[PDB]
Each structure stands twice: as structure tokens, then as C-alpha cells.
Design an enzyme around this catalytic site. Structure first.
Site, PDB file in Angstrom:
ATOM      1  N   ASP A  35      42.744  -3.200 -52.679  1.00  0.00           N
ATOM      2  CA  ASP A  35      42.640  -3.025 -53.843  1.00  0.00           C
ATOM      3  C   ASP A  35      43.410  -2.491 -54.825  1.00  0.00           C
ATOM      4  O   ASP A  35      43.919  -1.369 -54.675  1.00  0.00           O
ATOM      5  CB  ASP A  35      41.120  -3.049 -54.500  1.00  0.00           C
ATOM      6  CG  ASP A  35      40.845  -1.303 -54.605  1.00  0.00           C
ATOM      7  OD1 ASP A  35      41.298  -0.756 -53.390  1.00  0.00           O
ATOM      8  OD2 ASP A  35      40.286  -0.860 -55.317  1.00  0.00           O
ATOM      9  N   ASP A  36      43.852  -2.993 -55.833  1.00  0.00           N
ATOM     10  CA  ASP A  36      44.791  -2.255 -56.942  1.00  0.00           C
ATOM     11  C   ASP A  36      45.978  -2.069 -56.462  1.00  0.00           C
ATOM     12  O   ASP A  36      46.587  -0.971 -56.131  1.00  0.00           O
ATOM     13  CB  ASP A  36      44.062  -0.875 -57.528  1.00  0.00           C
ATOM     14  CG  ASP A  36      44.430  -0.848 -58.813  1.00  0.00           C
ATOM     15  OD1 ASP A  36      44.516  -1.626 -59.757  1.00  0.00           O
ATOM     16  OD2 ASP A  36      44.104   0.522 -59.373  1.00  0.00           O
TER      17      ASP A  36
ATOM     18  N   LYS B   3      52.074 -11.437 -42.936  1.00  0.00           N
ATOM     19  CA  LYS B   3      52.443 -12.519 -42.048  1.00  0.00           C
ATOM     20  C   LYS B   3      52.485 -12.254 -40.591  1.00  0.00           C
ATOM     21  O   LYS B   3      53.009 -12.957 -40.006  1.00  0.00           O
ATOM     22  CB  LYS B   3      53.992 -12.848 -42.706  1.00  0.00           C
ATOM     23  CG  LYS B   3      53.914 -13.842 -43.959  1.00  0.00           C
ATOM     24  CD  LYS B   3      55.201 -14.476 -43.887  1.00  0.00           C
ATOM     25  CE  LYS B   3      56.374 -13.672 -44.404  1.00  0.00           C
ATOM     26  NZ  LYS B   3      56.456 -13.572 -45.757  1.00  0.00           N
TER      27      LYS B   3
ATOM     28  N   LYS C 189      32.602  -4.146 -68.077  1.00  0.00           N
ATOM     29  CA  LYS C 189      32.645  -2.625 -67.931  1.00  0.00           C
ATOM     30  C   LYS C 189      32.721  -2.256 -69.589  1.00  0.00           C
ATOM     31  O   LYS C 189      31.811  -1.226 -69.792  1.00  0.00           O
ATOM     32  CB  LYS C 189      33.679  -2.163 -67.192  1.00  0.00           C
ATOM     33  CG  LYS C 189      33.656  -0.804 -66.736  1.00  0.00           C
ATOM     34  CD  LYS C 189      34.767  -0.311 -65.779  1.00  0.00           C
ATOM     35  CE  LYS C 189      35.026   1.121 -65.610  1.00  0.00           C
ATOM     36  NZ  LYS C 189      35.923   1.369 -64.488  1.00  0.00           N
TER      37      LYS C 189
ATOM     38  N   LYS D 116      36.494  -6.789 -60.978  1.00  0.00           N
ATOM     39  CA  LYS D 116      37.084  -7.620 -59.414  1.00  0.00           C
ATOM     40  C   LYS D 116      36.864  -6.744 -58.166  1.00  0.00           C
ATOM     41  O   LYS D 116      36.692  -7.436 -57.232  1.00  0.00           O
ATOM     42  CB  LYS D 116      38.875  -7.721 -59.865  1.00  0.00           C
ATOM     43  CG  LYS D 116      39.190  -8.413 -61.074  1.00  0.00           C
ATOM     44  CD  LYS D 116      40.617  -8.230 -61.328  1.00  0.00           C
ATOM     45  CE  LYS D 116      41.090  -7.028 -61.738  1.00  0.00           C
ATOM     46  NZ  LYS D 116      40.281  -6.583 -63.051  1.00  0.00           N
ATOM     47  N   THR D 117      37.022  -5.472 -58.157  1.00  0.00           N
ATOM     48  CA  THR D 117      36.685  -4.589 -57.057  1.00  0.00           C
ATOM     49  C   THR D 117      35.338  -4.809 -56.566  1.00  0.00           C
ATOM     50  O   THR D 117      35.209  -5.123 -55.667  1.00  0.00           O
ATOM     51  CB  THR D 117      37.020  -3.259 -57.584  1.00  0.00           C
ATOM     52  OG1 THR D 117      38.524  -3.139 -58.058  1.00  0.00           O
ATOM     53  CG2 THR D 117      37.112  -2.570 -56.151  1.00  0.00           C
TER      54      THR D 117
END
Ligand SMILES: Nc1ncnc2c1ncn2[C@@H]1O[C@H](COP(=O)(O)OP(=O)(O)OP(=O)(O)O)[C@@H](O)[C@H]1O
Ligand SMILES: Nc1ncnc2c1ncn2[C@@H]1O[C@H](COP(=O)(O)OP(=O)(O)OP(=O)(O)O)[C@@H](O)[C@H]1O
Ligand SMILES: Nc1ncnc2c1ncn2[C@@H]1O[C@H](COP(=O)(O)OP(=O)(O)O)[C@@H](O)[C@H]1O
Ligand SMILES: [Mg+2]
Ligand SMILES: [Mg+2]
Ligand SMILES: [Mg+2]
Ligand SMILES: [Mg+2]
Lengths: 535, 34, 107, 107
Positions: free
Chosen positions: A398-399, A426, A503, A344-345
Site C-alpha cells: 500500500d502507498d 512479473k 476520513k 483505500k487501505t
């Protein structure tokens, strides 16, 4: 003639991409002093007698000092180094400081409302003018000097033929009184060259070699100017000198006794490779960039193992195109979800790279090892603040679950970080600006519980290999097992279920490739079947 | 609640002729040379 | 007279070669080409590392290499004095002969 | 080169001889840099001190060509006690981020 000379020049002198600042300062100052006096009396206003220059190291302040010293038709400039007026004997410091202004006062007395102007350049002005608070030191030389100078610049007597230009490297260490109106006004900042000043600088510093035909036709100035970013004039000059040094040494040979290869180095030219090597291993900008991050997050490239990989990139491109060409929605967010070990990263980094936004950053937990939550909040706030100074931006967080310190025993996490992240998703940027936020997480349900999933605008799945054919295609595209080995592997996987991430597939292949040729396939199959698990 | 402090001193340009020898200059100019 | 073997600093080869390339290269080539190229010389070197890998031996041997005046050494903080405005004079008293010769001869 | 970081975990019943089989594996590798991070050198330390010590030991390993590091008795690094349960969270987060941090290029 009043002050200026016919030959404006400003290109032979050496000063480079500083045009707007000089024009603005010539607008503010040196304007009331050059005009028929009658009109000035008709409005009845006085001049401005103070200028302050500051900026990051290596921008061209000192060069401006000398050039101004030459770029006028006045009497002469008096340039005095900063910390050279302090003397041991009592009372000599004030004598030295007061000795400077005698000529201007005398001439004003002789010719009031007339005469020229005297310009005093105080280099390293922050050395002598420090805060008058405590100084925790016996004797008050530092306080007395500043008080005397302040009295002289502005006092009961009025002087109107003196101008002071104070240049400093850090405005923080400057007394408050001088920056107040009436003492030193019109303060400018000299920043880094953007794109055209960079080319002008590189041309100014390379004119000589091309004058004598010492630069090979291979070199292109525009290519170097585009390639080098976030550089300051000093950095450009250093790069040029480094390329020159690479060649000079290329034409020499010295292992035992220094020896020059004369009649072998009589002809000398500089090639593009010299510039590339110097730029790669000799000169590095002080501001810094994110080359390491970009080359480290996508370590083994991106391959095409099936249809799903293309859809995510397509949706990311659509979101980018949306943030470019809309005015009703100046803020857009997106969330990437999936099981662990699915890449995903890397996909987020690739999506961010595909767009050509001028400003891009990745805020990852790797930089905040051992930080308390307050430090994390400060760092995130600083990242967003810096991202709030451009017409376009892209920040990748990320994460997320590792930012909040989530652990499923109880459970327990940090509240300040959660609230800060919930509020920063926001807040719209200042008018006429855009922003795009991408998030990466592995546990959707936990986020759904804390009421954060509704702050994001959309979510995109990131699946993993879920079919034997896809596994075979990925193995073929990686190119490790071929011929009979792939035949037997395909035979074993009878189009059945394979719930393995990319991975883990890499790790399993590497672990399997460590034994003798006869046993590799068996070990790979055993590991795939054992860890294979179920969905 | 503690802060040790260092100090820096300065010398004085002691002058033999800034008083009591300006009078001695007068005693050398207006008297001895007269 | 000067040979890299005599200085006995074996172990560092890339570092010494790089230093010789970047600094002591513009003062070897014939004196006319350098003028045309219109390049100033680099003035400054900085060495850092763990405690005792040979940083003071390099300094000493580089100092003894050159066929010029002897080096001027400043052992740590040896330029601090009590009287106000005397440390500045002390530091300013180092770049003294260089300025004189620069103003007298020229190039 | 596809996998520049590998981690393994030894598990078993207590009083079985695990801390004396990691040492042998570490020794027999003949790597240049080997360090052992045990919790008997951090008696009485607070959470931050333990985090700093572990971070320093891990930083000492990023300035070599290839190295092995041993973290023995995990259950005692991040304090644990069945009642509660209770433990330190900072140490757990530090370890969980340090176990997936590839070193600089080519190491
Ligand atoms: N606009 C520019 N035009 C030409 N040269 C420049 C320019 N900007 C920087 N340089 C080069 O880089 C250097 C600029 O730094 P300079 O010598 O002016 O000192 P400075 O920036 O005032 O130093 P400090 O920050 O310590 O006060 C010079 O060597 C100059 O040749
Ligand atoms: N098509 C692909 N998409 C993504 N990654 C790929 C692809 N092909 C090969 N890879 C490799 O897989 C890696 C993906 O794993 P990565 O290092 O990004 O961790 P991750 O998925 O973020 O892990 P975790 O969620 O456990 O933190 C990529 O860095 C790259 O090395
Ligand atoms: N590369 C080297 N080659 C030979 N001797 C060395 C080397 N590095 C250090 N030494 C030895 O170390 C001593 C000097 O080290 P020193 O210059 O004091 O290091 P440092 O100043 O960094 O502490 C001498 O005995 C010298 O022979
Ligand atoms: Mg300067
Ligand atoms: Mg991840
Ligand atoms: Mg030493
Ligand atoms: Mg044990």
C-alpha cells in the site's frame, strides 16, 4: 531380537507430533544394522555413523535425547554436556575426549564384524566444535579438540559400532569438516507442529487433570488447538501452566498475611475464561503474527454509505475466486486508485481478510522510517521470498508512491526500488503455487508515466461521497445528528454537490462536536461549505 | 587496520615423579629397600 | 512474619501482585492437589527498565521474604578467570547445594 | 476516540512571534509529557543523524498516556534554499510518514 523392544510406545513416552521425522531416520539408519549379515555382504556396503539435529528453540530435542536413551536395548548411552571437557592442565582435554571411545574400539577388536552399537549424544555440540580459522587466541585447545575428535570418528582405523547424535540450536556455528560426507550425514530439521501434532501435545500435557477429573466440561481441547497458531511445545506447556496458575491464585486471598482459603478451595476447576485470559495476556508466540496490523488498519469498521462500496468488494471476491481455481494464470495483480482520503487501505485490508488464504501479509512504509533504498529493496525481497513458501499467499503493498520517495519538484525518486518492484510483478512462483498482489496509490497519472500501469492486470475506482442524499445516509448511519438538527442539515444541502471523503467527514464531525449545543450545526455547516471545495 | 587482542594462559600439572625422581624411586626401591 | 507495608516499595502494586500470582502461588496451596495437577514450577524472572525505578530493591526484598537459605549474589561479571576452562567451573559451582538436596530428600 | 491524532500548523510572515505562541499552548495544556524538537541542537548533523534524532524523540512519546510535541521551523529541518531549489529528501519522507502514524491502542 536385535536392538528394538516389543513395546514401541511413542505415545506414553511424551514425544508428540514427530512421526515423519522419526520414521525417516529409522529408514536411513538402524536399517542396515538390523538385517541378516549375509545379504549386506552380498551388496557389500557399510553403515552410517553420524546424525545431526537442529531446529528453533523449544521443539523437543533434549527430550528425544533421553527417550532414545530409554528406547533401545543396547548397553547404555553416554550423554556428555558440551562445554565440560575443557580442563586447565595441559593435555587433559585430549585425555578426556579420547577416554570416551575406548570401550567401542576394544569391543570391536575383540569381536570384529559383530557386537552391538554404542551411541554417544553430544549435547550443545556447537560449544566445542567452532570454526578452526583464527580464534585470535593463544593456545589451540579449541582446534586440538576438534582435530582429535575428527581423527577419532574417521581415521586410518575403521570403527563400525559407534553412532553420534549431535544436537545444536543454530547450525551456522558448526565447523565445515563434520558436515561433509563421511563424517556426519543425514541432517534433519525439526520444525513447529502444524495442526494435529498441536492437538496431540495439548492432550499429552492435559491427560493428568482429566484423569483425576480436574477439568470442567466447559473446556474444549479442539477449540484451543485451533485458536492457538504458530506455537511450539514449550509455548503450549507454558499456556497450560499459566491457566493452572490463574486458577490456583483465584482460590487464594493474601493482602496482609499469606492465607489459603482451605475448605473454600477444596473443590477446584479450571474454566475456559482462565484459558482465554492466559492466552490473551500471559503467553505470546515468538514467531509473531499480524493481529496488530489487522486491528489497526480497519479502525472504525466498514459501513455502507451507498452502492459504490459493494462493487469494489464484489470485484475483489471475483479476483480471489479466480486465483483459486485456475491453472493457466498462476499470478494475478490488481490496482486500487482514487482521490486522497477515500479509504483505500482499509478496503484492501478487508478484501485480503475476506479470503481464508493460509499466508497473508501487508508491507507498509511505516516499518521503514529512515531506511536507505538498499534496505527497502532487501526488506521487500525478503517479504516476497517468505511469501514464496506456501501453496497460497496474499501480499498487500500500500502507498506505492511513498515507497519510491516521489516529490513533484523536478521531480525526484529512487530507481532501485522502482526497478525491483517492476521486476517482482512479473516473476511467477515455483511450479504449483499461486499468488495475488494488491496495490494502493493516490496519483494514477504519475504511475502511468513511469510505465508501471501496464504491468498490473486491472484497476478499480474508489469514489467518495458526491451527492447530498449519500451524505445524509452516511450521517444517519453514523448516528450523531438526529431530529431537528438533521432536518436543518438536509435543508441546507439542497441536493447539491458534496465532494468530501469519508476520513475528512469523520474529522469534521469530531471537530464540530466540541462546542455548546446551540452552535454545533452552524460550525459543521461552515466547515463543510468552506473546505467543501469543488471537484 | 587495528585489533587489540586478549590472551588466556594455562597451568602445567608439574609432577615431581615424572623424571629424576623415577630414578629416585629406583634408588628408593631397588637400593634403599634392597 | 511478613507484610507488604514493611518492605516499603509503594508505587508498584499490579507488578508485585502479578509476580506473586505467577510464581509464588504453586508453593502455597496444599501439597496433594498440586501433585495431582501434574505441574512443574516456574524457575526464572527477568526485570528491565529505565535506570532507577526500583529493580534492585525488589530483588533484595524478595530475597529477604523467604524463610529459607540466604541468597547467592553474583555482582555483574564476577565469574571470569584467566585459566582455560575455569569460568565454566565457576558457574557450575553455583547449582551445587540444590542438586545435593534434590538428590537426597526429594520433593 | 474516533481521532486519536490531531495536527495543526501555525503560519505567518517572518519575525511575527510564532515560536513563542506554540510554547505557550504546549505549556498551558498541563500534559504529562512535553518535548520540543528545535533545529539548533543539530548543528552540522547529516541527514541520517537528523532522522535518527527525530525518530528517537517521537518514540519517547509513544510510551505515555497523552503528550504534545512541537516541530518548530520546519523550513530549516529539511534544508531549503530558493536557488535550485535544493533540500533533503530523507527528512521530508520521514516527516510525511510520521505525521500519519497513529500510536498504540488507547493513547
Ligand atoms: N513434541 C513434543 N512433545 C512433548 N513436549 C514437547 C514437545 N516439543 C516441545 N515440548 C516441550 O517443550 C520443551 C521442549 O524443549 P526441550 O526441553 O526439549 O529443550 P530444547 O528444545 O532442546 O532446548 P534448546 O533449544 O535450548 O536446545 C519441553 O519442556 C517439552 O515438554
Ligand atoms: N466504508 C468505509 N470504507 C472505508 N473506510 C471507512 C468506511 N467507513 C468508515 N471508514 C473509516 O475510514 C478509514 C479510511 O481511511 P484510512 O485510514 O484507510 O486512510 P486512507 O484512505 O488509506 O488514506 P490516504 O489515502 O490519505 O493514505 C477506515 O480506516 C475507517 O476508519
Ligand atoms: N518504588 C520505590 N519505593 C521506594 N523507594 C524507591 C522506589 N524505587 C526506588 N526507590 C529508591 O531508590 C533507591 C534504590 O533504587 P535502586 O534499587 O538502586 O534502583 P535501580 O537499581 O533500578 O537503579 C533507594 O533510595 C530507594 O528508596
Ligand atoms: Mg536442550
Ligand atoms: Mg492510503
Ligand atoms: Mg542495580
Ligand atoms: Mg521560528
Amino acid at each position: 531380537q536385535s536392538i528394538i523392544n516389543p513395546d514401541w510406545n511413542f505415545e506414553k513416552m511424551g514425544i508428540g507430533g514427530l512421526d515423519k521425522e522419526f520414521s525417516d531416520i529409522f529408514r536411513r539408519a538402524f536399517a542396515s544394522r538390523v538385517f541378516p549379515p549375509e545379504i549386506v555382504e552380498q551388496m557389500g556396503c557399510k553403515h552410517v555413523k553420524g546424525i545431526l539435529l537442529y531446529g528453533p528453540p523449544g521443539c523437543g530435542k533434549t527430550l528425544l535425547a533421553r527417550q532414545i536413551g530409554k528406547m533401545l536395548n543396547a548397553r547404555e548411552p553416554k550423554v556428555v554436556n558440551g562445554p565440560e571437557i575443557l580442563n586447565k592442565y595441559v593435555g587433559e582435554s585430549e585425555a578426556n575426549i579420547r577416554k570416551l571411545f575406548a570401550d567401542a574400539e576394544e569391543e570391536q577388536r575383540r569381536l570384529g564384524a559383530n557386537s552391538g552399537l554404542h551411541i554417544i549424544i553430544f549435547d550443545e555440540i556447537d560449544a566445542i566444535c567452532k570454526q578452526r580459522g583464527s580464534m585470535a587466541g593463544s593456545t589451540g585447545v579449541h582446534d586440538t579438540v576438534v582435530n582429535q575428535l575428527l581423527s577419532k570418528i574417521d581415521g586410518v582405523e575403521q570403527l563400525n559400532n559407534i553412532l553420534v547424535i549431535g544436537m545444536t540450536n543454530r547450525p551456522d556455528l558448526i565447523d565445515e569438516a563434520l558436515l561433509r560426507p563421511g563424517r556426519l550425514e543425514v541432517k534433519m530439521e525439526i520444525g513447529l507442529p502444524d495442526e494435529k501434532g498441536r492437538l496431540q501435545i495439548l492432550h499429552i500435557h492435559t491427560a493428568r487433570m482429566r484423569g483425576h477429573q480436574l477439568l470442567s466440561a466447559d473446556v474444549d481441547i479442539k477449540e484451543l488447538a485451533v485458536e492457538t497458531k504458530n506455537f511450539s511445545g514449550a509455548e503450549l506447556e507454558g499456556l497450560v501452566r499459566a491457566a493452572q496458575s490463574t486458577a490456583m491464585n483465584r482460590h487464594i486471598k493474601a493482602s496482609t498475611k499469606v492465607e489459603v482459603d482451605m475448605e473454600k478451595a477444596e473443590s477446584l476447576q479450571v474454566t475456559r475464561g482462565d484459558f482465554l485470559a492466559s492466552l490473551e495476556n500471559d503467553i505470546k508466540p515468538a514467531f509473531g503474527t499480524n493481529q496488530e496490523d489487522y486491528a489497526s488498519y480497519i479502525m472504525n469498521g466498514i459501513i455502507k454509505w451507498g452502492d459504490p462500496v459493494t462493487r469494489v468488494l464484489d470485484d475483489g471476491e471475483l479476483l480471489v475466486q479466480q486465483t483459486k481455481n485456475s491453472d493457466r494464470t498462476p499470478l494475478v495483480s490488481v490496482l486500487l486508485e482514487g482521490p486522497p482520503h477515500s479509504g483505500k487501505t482499509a478496503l484492501a485490508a478487508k478484501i485480503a481478510e475476506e479470503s481464508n488464504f493460509p499466508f497473508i501479509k501487508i508491507c507498509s512504509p511505516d516499518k521503514m522510517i529512515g531506511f536507505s533504498e538498499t534496505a527497502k529493496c532487501q526488506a521487500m525481497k525478503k517479504i516476497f521470498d517468505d511469501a514464496y513458501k506456501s501453496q497460497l499467499s496474499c501480499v498487500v503493498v500500500d502507498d506505492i508512491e511513498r515507497l519510491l520517495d516521489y516529490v513533484p519538484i523536478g521531480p525526484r525518486f529512487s530507481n532501485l526500488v522502482l526497478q525491483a518492484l517492476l521486476v517482482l510483478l512479473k516473476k511467477a512462483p515455483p511450479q504449483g503455487r499461486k499468488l495475488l498482489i494488491i496495490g494502493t496509490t493516490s496519483r494514477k497519472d504519475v504511475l502511468q508515466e513511469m510505465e508501471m500501469l501496464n504491468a498490473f492486470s486491472t484497476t478499480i475506482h474508489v469514489p467518495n461521497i458526491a451527492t447530498g442524499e449519500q451524505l445524509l445516509e452516511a450521517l444517519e448511519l453514523l448516528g450523531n445528528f438526529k431530529d431537528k438538527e438533521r432536518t436543518t442539515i438536509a435543508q441546507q444541502v439542497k441536493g447539491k454537490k458534496v465532494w468530501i471523503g469519508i476520513k475528512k467527514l469523520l474529522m469534521l464531525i469530531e471537530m464540530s462536536l466540541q462546542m455548546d449545543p446551540e452552535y454545533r450545526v452552524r460550525k459543521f455547516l461552515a466547515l463543510l461549505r468552506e473546505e467543501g471545495a469543488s471537484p | 587496520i587495528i585489533m587489540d587482542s586478549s590472551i588466556s594462559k594455562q597451568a602445567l600439572s608439574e609432577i615431581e615423579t615424572r623424571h629424576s625422581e623415577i630414578i629416585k624411586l629406583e634408588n628408593s626401591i631397588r637400593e634403599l629397600h634392597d
